[PDB]
Each structure stands twice: as C-alpha cells, then as structure tokens.
C-alpha cells in the first residue's frame, strides 16, 4: 500500500503517490518492467531530489520568470523612431520587431514571442506601451517611442 509510480498510468497518482497506494498489484506487473516503486525510505528521499532536483528547478524557473522582470523597467527611453511622417502618420511598421528588438540597441536580446498587446499598435509616435509578457507567471513593462527624422 506504498509505492511511487512517478509515471502515472490511470492510477490515482502521478509523479508517484506518497500516500497509501495499491498493494500486490505492483509485486508482479507495475514494478517489473513497468514503473518501479518501493516507497521505502531509501528510494523515497532519492525521488525527493528530483522532486528534490526540481525543487531546485522550481527555484530556477520561478526566478527565471522573476529575475528578468525587474531587469527591464528602469530602461532608458526606447528611442526607435518608426519613420513618423505622412502629414502626421508614419512609415515605419510597428508590430513585433521594434517592440522587442528595442533592447539590443546596446546589446541585450530578447524573443519576439513574448509581447503583450492584443490590438496591433496604432502606428503613432506616442508612449508606445509595451507590457513585456515573458511568461504567464511573470509579466514586465517596456516602452517604445517614435521620433522625427
């Protein structure tokens, strides 16, 4: 009544049940070739590491989302003019590139797949708001501005 599947299979448990499991069912099938289990001290703690190892990874991921947050806010004004012209309109295309690529104007780089703006951005020059959306867990804030040339 104590095993650790980890590799859930229709069983009332995933990542390995730490509480009362089925018995005699694993003695010949589950354990053999299937998903070994022995929820006995030794094997337990070891799973821990992985669960243990990804407790370290949990830290990692959570903080990936929230290192990177904070990292880009105080940013110097994004001065990427989008060819403002046309008697009061623009020429430059404001969509995905200038939004994200506005970071390596010094070096750092990002991924265009993180932008957060439902509507496409009206081709203006004003305070183009850029709510950096790296991951669901963590959101950021960026800006964009157009100039005349």
């Amino acid at each position: 009544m104590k095993v650790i599947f980890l590799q859930d299979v229709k069983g009332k448990g995933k990542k390995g049940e730490v509480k009362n499991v089925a018995d005699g069912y694993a003695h010949n099938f589950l354990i053999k070739k299937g998903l070994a289990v022995e929820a006995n001290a030794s094997n337990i703690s070891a799973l821990n590491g992985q669960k243990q190892k990804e407790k370290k990874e949990a830290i990692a991921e959570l903080e990936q989302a929230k290192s990177l947050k904070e990292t880009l806010e105080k940013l110097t004004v994004e001065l990427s003019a989008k060819s403002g012209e046309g008697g009061r309109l623009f020429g430059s295309v404001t969509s995905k590139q200038i939004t994200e690529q506005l970071q390596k104007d010094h070096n750092i780089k990002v991924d265009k797949r993180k932008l957060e703006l439902p509507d496409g951005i009206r081709a203006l020059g004003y305070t183009n708001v850029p709510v950096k959306l790296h991951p669901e867990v963590q959101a950021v804030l960026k800006v964009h501005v157009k100039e005349e040339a």
Binding site: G24, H27, N28, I31, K32
Partner: protein
C-alpha cells in the same frame, strides 16, 4: 522443493480434531514457479509466497 530465497521447509504436524485422537499430517510450504534470478539468466526456481511479496524483483 526448498526455495532458495529463504529457509522454509516442510514440517510434520498433527490434525487435532474434536475429541482429539489425533491423526498425523505433514505441512508443506507454499511455493510458486514464478521466475527468480540466480546466476544469469533465469530460469527457473521455486519461491515461497511470503518471500514473493515485495523484496526481490521477479
């Protein structure tokens, strides 16, 4: 007939029936032909039902 994993053995006993007389009766150990690993690779060896639970992998 003896299993290798443990020292279980047949042990003679008696049938103490009502108005115990009582008739003799040997008691064999429980056993299974399920495969066990000795020098590689199986098979085959008998195993006690008690030892078969948990413990050594089939």
């Amino acid at each position: 007939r003896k299993c290798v994993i443990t020292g279980k053995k047949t042990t003679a006993g008696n049938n103490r029936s009502h108005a115990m007389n009582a008739s003799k009766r040997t008691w064999g150990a429980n056993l299974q032909k399920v495969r066990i690993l000795v020098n590689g690779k199986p098979k085959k060896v008998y195993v006690s039902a008690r030892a078969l639970k948990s413990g050594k992998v089939e």
